[PDB]
Amino acid sequence: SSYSGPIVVDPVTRIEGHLRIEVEVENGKVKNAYSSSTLFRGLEIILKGRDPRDAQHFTQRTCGVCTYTHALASTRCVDNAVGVHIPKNATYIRNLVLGAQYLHDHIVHFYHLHALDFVDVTAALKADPAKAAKVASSISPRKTTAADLKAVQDKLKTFVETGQLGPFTNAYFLGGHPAYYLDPETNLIATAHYLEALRLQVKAARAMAVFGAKNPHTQFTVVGGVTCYDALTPQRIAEFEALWKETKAFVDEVYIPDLLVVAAAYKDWTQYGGTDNFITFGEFPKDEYDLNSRFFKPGVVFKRDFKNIKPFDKMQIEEHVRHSWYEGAEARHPWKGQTQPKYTDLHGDDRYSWMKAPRYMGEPMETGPLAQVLIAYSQGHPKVKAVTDAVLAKLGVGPEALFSTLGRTAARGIETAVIAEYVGVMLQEYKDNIAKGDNVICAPWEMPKQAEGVGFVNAPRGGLSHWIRIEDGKIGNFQLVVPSTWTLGPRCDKNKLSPVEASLIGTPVADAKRPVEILRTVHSFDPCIACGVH
């Protein structure tokens, strides 16, 4: 009984923003895919003519999931344009807020965005909580008892019997689903940790506000450094440290073990949603003007040739519009970018998305945790190598298993673990620096009348870049090229499928009415359509 025909998923939920996924299915497997982004705001148009200092305030509102990242990218971009070298402490504080962002973001993604593709919450009601506690205590140094899990089950039971299932209404697992494999106990463990993560993420986000004023949308960055003199104090540092420590413990004791248990039960998912090419910009600089000073280094890989990592040349990026709702067909380097909307409706003139299609030396590039992890591994990054190897050894799989939806999901966990530890290193360096008597957090600068600048951030979804042309001291052009633009943008003028589109080819679909397999792959990229389109 295998389906042949179209499937449309609109809206794709449990992502940021407005995504329409279209596939052609033949004999129960995807043979073709379109990634259609269906909201445009036009932030690049809006920025024209404004004060370059104002850009980060506008561009932070690209996205509130990956909050801060755009403020950081814009500030790095205008810092660069202006030629200011910010103080060491501004780099530490900016880096620490970014590390905290990664932890918050990836924990919410795994539990609150991804996990309902794999966890049947309502079967948790069937579980034996004593059995479940045994399983939970075996996978984590954290002891969980039967009473602990019964409390969760009792709460869920009361919720489900009220007949108001809320966010679980019409879930693809309701009633059972052949593509959902977990036993009741494991469903209960995952559900308990979903609930727990709702409160832990409050602390993970609070860590950003300690130095960064507030979450969402931090307000501590300025051209030349940061503003938060209070971040130098022992008390604020202690507060940050305490939140970081609790967040890292959750990563280490709850998220990664759950990630491994789910991956082990869905090991068939090593066979779907692979991609060919990877790009990453590096993150957590010692030197704001040298990407190779970053804890994770930039790199480019084509056709999985990790033995030949290519250097990242920022002049080889062009953004295509041939299959996008913009004027014409000409790809542009972002320093010569154009944002000229022209809507033709779905597949009108072969156009189907508000996202541009970024290509690197003409190739579609996956960016994000899998790119950052695999390129770092391949550069000999010792922390990445040790976590990655441990994960691979725990799952009983080889390296090729990483080129898949499961692999990508695993890489998101690996990066979270590695960054959670690295935050402690940065924190200590920061403390050390203060202890040497360096209490400087902002440097003076002057606005040039004419300049070009670029800022690079490796955000939780990958390589982010903001590009400015200053003219008469104002914004002459401002272009964002965002990780989800790379990953989820449409085809280019060479008709090459984007990473998400290509990864969907081969996806089995058990039940076309409930196409959870498509969600699993799409969600593994952690799409952000406000980011991708801006």
């Binding site: 939920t13 506008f58 196409p515």
Partner: protein
């Protein structure tokens, strides 16, 4: 998704960055889990709901058409240019979705400056013709309670909802339809640096010893004096707010602030 028991909430996303959604996840005493399991029935929310596609559309239908009634919480501006083309969900323009759904709500809350006043995508030259909910749907008699900020304090959303459930009415609203219980004071009159303001003690730059010392940020652009919000009182994430982090207020709870308050580092 609903029925009796808990009050049904339909949460819509228009032209938005999802920062407002994330702000609600930061809910503190009550936390978001209490709100979703005990207080409210969250019957549609694209960010966290299990269903997608046709199944999500069916969930939304079932919620909106329930004889028990629903509350609408709306995030994002409505793009109205080119007959609403710039924003679609399930291949329906956002304008069309909100025009159909919001008049059916028992109460509508516009959550965040984009939903209340148009927000970032409404900033000049406003290519998508983005409008706040009450502006866009004026003709259909929609009058949403406006909870402004970018994003708002989630304290203010929960407080407004709790009031509504208790009193079966909107709380006192200001002339921008914002609750006076949260938006009745300027940020500035509540600010700890007000004594420096009064004394004309202004930081001349962010690197200055005056900035280190906590002097007033007015000369560096602070919009506290023209901005109505509860930030210094409630704070964010139970721990900080922009001026205590050393940065000026950018006026983010005010209409058209992207154009009115800019350049952000000038007064």
């Amino acid at each position: 998704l609903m029925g009796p028991r808990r009050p049904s909430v339909v949460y819509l996303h228009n032209a938005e960055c999802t920062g407002c959604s994330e702000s609600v996840l930061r809910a503190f005493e009550p936390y978001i889990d209490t709100l979703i399991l005990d207080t409210l029935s969250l019957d549609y929310h694209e960010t966290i709901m299990a269903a997608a596609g046709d199944a999500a559309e069916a969930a939304l239908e079932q919620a909106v058409n329930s004889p028990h009634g629903f509350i609408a919480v709306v995030e994002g501006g409505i793009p109205t240019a080119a007959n609403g083309i710039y924003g679609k969900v399930a291949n329906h323009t956002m304008l069309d979705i909100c025009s159909r759904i919001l008049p059916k709500a028992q109460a509508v809350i516009a959550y965040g400056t984009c939903a209340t006043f148009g927000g970032v995508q409404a900033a000049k030259p406003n290519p998508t013709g983005a409008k706040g909910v009450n502006d866009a749907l004026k003709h259909l008699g929609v009058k949403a309670i406006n909870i402004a900020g970018c994003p708002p304090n989630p304290y203010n959303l929960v407080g407004t909802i709790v009031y509504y459930l208790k009193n079966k009415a909107a709380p006192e609203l200001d002339s921008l339809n914002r609750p006076t219980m949260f938006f009745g004071q300027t940020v500035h009159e509540q600010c700890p640096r007000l004594p420096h303001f009064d004394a004309g003690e202004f930081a001349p730059s962010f690197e200055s010893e005056e900035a280190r010392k906590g002097w007033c940020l007015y000369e560096l652009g602070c919009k506290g004096p023209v901005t109505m919000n509860n930030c210094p009182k409630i704070k964010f994430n139970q721990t900080n707010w922009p001026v205590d982090a050393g940065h000026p207020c950018i006026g983010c709870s005010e209409p058209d602030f992207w154009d009115a308050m800019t350049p952000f580092y000038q007064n």
